[model samples]
Target chain A: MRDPFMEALGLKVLHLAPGEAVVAGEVRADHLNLHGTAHGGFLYALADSAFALASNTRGPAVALSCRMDYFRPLGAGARVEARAVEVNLSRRTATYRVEVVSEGKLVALFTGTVFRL
Target chain B: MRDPFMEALGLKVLHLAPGEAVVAGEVRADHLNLHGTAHGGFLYALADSAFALASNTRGPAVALSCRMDYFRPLGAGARVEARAVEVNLSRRTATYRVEVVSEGKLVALFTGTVFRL
Candidate 1:
C-alpha cells in the first residue's frame, strides 16, 4: 500500500519481512527545525513508517503509542536509515523498536505500540 | 523562531508562553496516512512544534526525547489543536505534556524532554 505521508517524506523501504523492516531517506537542509538540526518530526515520521510496515506484516494494526529518543543531532546532507524490529507481539497488540541511523551511526530510537485491527 | 517545517504543515500558534503553548491547524485529506486516518507524523509534528515553542520560552533547547500516545484516530476534515504545557522544569532539562485535540476531543498526547543548549 502507498503511504501518502511517507511518500511526501521521501522515505523508501530498503528491506522488509515479518516483524522487521528497514527504510532509508536523506535529511537535507529543508528538513531542519528551529534548532538547526534535522527535525524530530521528520525522523519520527521515518521511524514510524518503518514500524507500521513491520507491524502490518503480521496483520492489520493501528498505532497506540510511540516513544522516541534522540541520541545525537542529525544535520543537513545526512544519509539516514530506520530499522524496525518487533519486541513483543500478541493477539491484541504488538510492539516495535525502530532505530534511526545517520551515516552508519544510531542517532535516534523509537519504540511504538500498535493495536491489531 | 520561524520554523519552516511547521510553516509547511500550515500550523499556527494560537497561544504561547515560556512553558505553555497552544497551536491550531486543520487535518485534511492530504494529511491522511495509508489507514485513511490523520497521519501520526502530521499530528506528531504539530504537537512537537507546540512542545518546542513552550520549552524554548526560557532558553534555547533541543529535544532529547518524546513519548506520544494516540487516544483516538483523527480523520480528514478534522479541526485540530495541540496544547503543550510544562510538567517539569529544571536548569538542565525540562519536560512538557502536549495534547492534540480534535473538535474539542482529545486525540493524541505527547510528552517531550529538551536539553538546554
Candidate 2:
C-alpha cells in the first residue's frame, strides 16, 4: 500500500512478511496531549500502521472491525514498537492481533478483523 | 469540561449530568474510509468524546485505560448517538461504559477507565 500519510507522520516499517509485520518509531512533541503525555490517538495510529501492512501484505485488504486496549500512558521522545500477526484466516476475512510496546513494557493491545477483496 | 475539539467535530451534547452524558451527531461523507464505509477512526473519536465527558463530569480526569468492541459497520450521513455513564468510581480512578447506537441498533461498545486529578 502506498501510504504517504504514515510516512508523513514519521512511522517506519522495520520488518514485513506475508501475515506479520513490525514497526517502530520515535514519538514527537506534536503527538502529546494536554497532560504532556502521548495522546492515545498516536499509539492508535502506530498500531494501525502495523495492521495495514499485515493485512495488505499480498494484495488489497480493508479493516472490517477493530478494538483497542490501552494499558498505560507514554510521552513524546519515547520509542514505541508494534508487532502485528494474523490470528485467523478465511476465504474473505482475516483476524489479527497487534501489540504495542514502549520502554520495555506493554503499552497497548489490539485485535482487528479485515476483509480481503 | 470544555472540549472545543469534540464540539468542533460536530458532536453535540443532548444531555449531561454528573457522571453521565448523552451525545449525538450526524456522520458525513468525510468520515468514510476507502471502502465507502465509516472509518473506524471516526468511531474511536466519537467514543473518545463520550469518554472525555464521562471522565470529567464533576472534575478533571484523564484516561488511564480503554477498550472498544466493534460489532458492525456504519456509514456517512448516518445519525450516531453515544451514551456514557459511570460504572465504577474510586478515590483515584473511575470506570465507564459507553455505547454507540444508530437507528436503534448498537454499533459499538466501549469501556474506559479514568484517573481523577
Candidate 3:
C-alpha cells in the first residue's frame, strides 16, 4: 500500500497476507527494453513487490540477496501476476519463492532472502 | 541510446564499449520503497541497464538469469552508477558482472546471464 515505485509501475496488490502476497500489473511501453520485449527489470520489480510484502509480514525486512530466472518473455499489454510465498523462516532471516505468470504460463521464478531488521 | 525504462528512471549512459558499459542516475522519491530507502528493484533495474548494454554489444540479447546481492542501501537524491563488464562469453550465452556504486561505495553486486538472440 502506498508504494511509490509500485504505483509508478501500475502494480496492484491483489492479495496480501502473512507470509504470502500476490501482485499484478500490465505490461506497458515503458516496461519494455530496446528489443520491444518486457524488460527483465520490470519482471524483477513485480516479483520483488510480492517478496517485499511477504517477507515483511513478521516485521520490517530487507532483501539480502535475490536470484531470478526467466523462462519466457512478455510483451506489451500482457497481464502479469507475481505470487510470493515464504519457503523458510527464522528469527533473523527468511526466504521466499516468487513466480511470475503471464497468460496462464509461468514466465519467471525468483528466490530471495530477507534480513529481518 | 533510447531506452524507455532507463529514460523514465533518468538513467544516463556515460560510457559504452564492446562488452562493457557504465550508466548513472540520481535516486528519486519514485525509486524508493515504502520504507523510504531506494527500492531493490530500482537498483536491479540500474544494473540491468548496464548489463543489457554490455551484453548486447554485438547483437540482440536478453537476460536468462540474474543474481543480485545487496551490500548497502541507497538513499534518495544520491547519485548511483552501475558498471557492467562481460565476465564470460560463448556463442549462445554471455555472463556479466555489474556493480552498483553510490558515494564512492559499493551498494550492490549483480550477476546476469544473457542469451544471445
Candidate 4:
C-alpha cells in the first residue's frame, strides 16, 4: 500500500510482520504545535501508521477507533519510533497497542481498533 | 496561540468562545490515507485543534489523553468542520467533546482531556 500521508509525515516502516510493525521518523519544525513541541496529532499519526501496518497484515483494514495517552513532550528534530503489536484479533476486528519512544524515553501510548474489510 | 501544525494542515478557527470552539477545513489530496480516504490523523488533528482552542480559553492547556471514533470515511476535497465543547473543567484538568462533520453528516466523535499548564 502506498501511504502518502505517512510519507508526507516522513514516517517509514522499519520492520513488518504478521501482527507487528515498527515505524520511525524524525519530528520536523513543521510538526510542532503552538507549544513548540511535537503536536499531539503528529505523535498520534506516527502510532496510527504503525497500527495500520500491523493490523493490515492479514489484509485490508480500516481503523474504527483510536486513543492516545501522552506521557512526555517531544520537540522538533526528535527521532521517534512507534512499535505496534496486535493484542487481540477476531474475524471482524483487531486491536493494537502502539508505544512511541523518543531516544529511549516513553512519549506516548496509543491503542487502536481496526475493522477488516 | 499560533498553531503551526494546524496551519500547515490548512485548518482555521471559525469560531472561538470560552469552553467552546469550532474549526473548519477542506481536505486535500495530501491528507489522504493509503486507502485513499482522508487519513484518521487528519480528522483527529482537526478535532484536536478545536479541543485545544476550547480548552485553552481559560489559559494554556495541553492534551493529556484523547480518543476518536471514526463513524464514516471522508474523501479528498471534503469540507469538514469540528466543534468542541468543554464538558468538565477543574483546576488541573478539563474534558471536551468534539464532533466532526462533513456536509452535515457526522464523520467522527472525539473526546479529550487536557491538563492546565
Candidate 5:
C-alpha cells in the first residue's frame, strides 16, 4: 500500500540505511492536541515508522514491544527528523532505539523490539 | 506524577472510570524481540496511558496524537484490557479512542488526543 494512512496525514519517508532509517515530516494542526502541542502519538508514530524501516532492513519484521519517553513538547509545524538504529539483532527478533530530533535536540526517545516475520 | 515511568514498567492503573482508563502489564524476556511478536511501542504505550486517562478527566492531561492499529500477535502474557472514550472535547484540544483487548479478541487499535493543563 502507499502507506495510505500516514501518507494521507502527510508523513514522508526520506532515507533508508542498512540498519537505520530517517523520515522527515511536518506537524500539522491535525497532529495537535487539546493542549496545542504536538501530540505524543505523532512523535511515537514517526519513531515507529523509522523503527519499522530499520528492522525490516534484512527482511519483513513485526513489532513486539516499544517504549517511548517524551522530554519536551513539540509544536505544530516544527520540523521533525527521526532516526532509527538497530541496537541488537538476532535470529527472530531485533532491538532498536529511535529518537525524534528537532533543531538537533532530542524531543523524544523510543526503544523497541521487532520480530522478523 | 506517581506514574514514575509506567510505575517502573509494571503499568497497572486498573480502573478509573469517568473518562476511562486501563493500565496493564506483562510479556517479559525484558519484553523480548529481534522477533518474538508484540511491540509497536508496547501497543503505543498501551494507547498512550489510555489517552492520558481520558484526557485528564479532572485535569493535568497531556498527549496529543496517537493512532495505532494491529490486528494480530500479542503473546508472552496476552491479557490486555484497554479502553478510553471521549470521542471529542475542546478547550485547547481533546479526542480519543483506545482499544487493546485480548481473548475477547481485537489485538489492538488506538486513536488518541489530549491536552489540558
Candidate 6:
C-alpha cells in the first residue's frame, strides 16, 4: 500500500479484505512511555494502521474520525496485533472497530469512520 | 517527563500548565498517508503528545480514552501545532481537548480522558 506510517511503525500486514485487516508488530525500545510500558501513541498507531489499510481495500478512503480506548499496558518487546472489522458500510462512508491485543489480553479498542472516494 | 514517544514523534513542548499545554512540530515526509496527506496516526500522536504532557503537570496520568476528528488535510512540510485545554478535573480523572493545526488551519480536534495515579 506504500503507507510509510505503517512501515515506520514496523507493522506487517497479515491479511486484508474488504471487511477486515490484521496487522502485527513488536514493541521496540523506542516505543515505550515514561512508565516503561507501551506508549499510547504506539498502540494507537498500530490500531490506526489496521484501520487505515482495511478501509482502502476497495477504494480511496479518508479518515473522518477515530476513537480509542486503552484497556491495559503491554511492556516493551511484547508482540502486538490489531484486527479491524467492518461495522457498517454505505455508499459514501464506512465504520470499523479495531481490537488490539497482546499476550491474550485486549490491550486497546479503536473505532473509526472514513469517507470513501 | 522522560517520554520517549514524544521525542520519537519530534514534538516539542512549547508550554504547559495544569490547565493547558501547547506542542509544536513540522510534518515530515514519512508522516504522510497513502493518499499523500498527513497520516491519521501522526495527527493523533501529535495531539496525544500534548494531552499526555498537559495532564501530568500535577502527577502521573494514564490515558483511558481519546477521540479524534479530522477536519482538513495538510501537506508535508507544514508546521504543525497542538493545544490541549482542560475541560474538567477531579481527584482521579481529568478531561482534555486538543486542537491540531497546520499552516494556520484547524486540521484536527482531539479529546482525551485520563486517570490520575
What TM-score, over all chains together, does every model reach?
0.96, 0.70, 0.98, 0.98, 0.65, 0.97
Per-residue lDDT for B2-117 in model 2, tens only?
44435444678887788988878777765554456665655666776777776787587877666667777887789998889989989998999989899999988878888798
Q: First chain TM-score in every candidate?
A: 0.96, 0.94, 0.98, 0.97, 0.94, 0.95
Q: Which runs in model 6 stand beyond 4 Å of their true positions?
A: none
Quantify all predictions' global Cα lDDT against the true fold. Answer: 0.89, 0.75, 0.93, 0.92, 0.69, 0.88
**Candidate DockQ scores, in order:** 0.76, 0.21, 0.80, 0.83, 0.11, 0.79
Q: For model 6, how does the per-residue alpha-carbon lDDT over A23-115 read when each residue is reduced to its tens digit?
A: 999999878877888888889888988898898885788889999999998987999999999999899999999999987899999999999
Give fnat, all candidates.
0.72, 0.13, 0.75, 0.77, 0.10, 0.79
**Backbone clashes, candidate 6:** 0
Specify the highest-DockQ model's number: 4
lDDT of 4 at B110: 98
DockQ of 6: 0.79
Query: Candidate 3 chain B: minimum summed lDDT over ten consecutive residues — where?
Result: B1-10
Model 2 off-target regions past 4 Å?
A1-17, A21-42, A56-67, A71-82, A88-94, A101-106, A113-117, B2-8
**Candidate 3: segments with Cα more than 4 A from true spot:** none
Off by over 4 Å in 5: B1-16, B19-46, B53-55, B63-99, B106-117
Q: TM-score, chain B only, every model?
A: 0.96, 0.93, 0.97, 0.97, 0.32, 0.94
Worst 10 residues of 5 chain B by lDDT: B1-10
Interface RMSD of each: 1.2, 4.4, 1.1, 0.9, 11.6, 1.2
**Which 10-residue span in candidate 2 chain B carries the lowest summed lDDT?**
B1-10
Clashes of each: 0, 0, 0, 0, 16, 0
Per-residue accuracy of model 6 over B16-86 as CA lDDT, tens digit each: 87778999988788777777877788888889888988888858899999999999998888899999999
Model 5: per-residue lDDT, tens digit, B2-79? 443344335677777777777676654433333455545555655676678667875776664455666677766666
Sorting all predicted structures by DockQ, with the top scorer first, yields 4, 3, 6, 1, 2, 5
Off by over 4 Å in 1: none
When summed lDDT is taken over every stretch of 10 residues in candidate 5 chain A, the lowest stretch is A1-10
Model 2, A9-32: lDDT tens digits are 477888999999887878787655
**Per-residue lDDT for B34 in model 1?**
79
Clashing pairs in 6: none
lDDT tens per residue, model 1, A1-111: 888878777789999998999988898666788878888888988898899899999999999999999999887888899999999999999999999998788999999
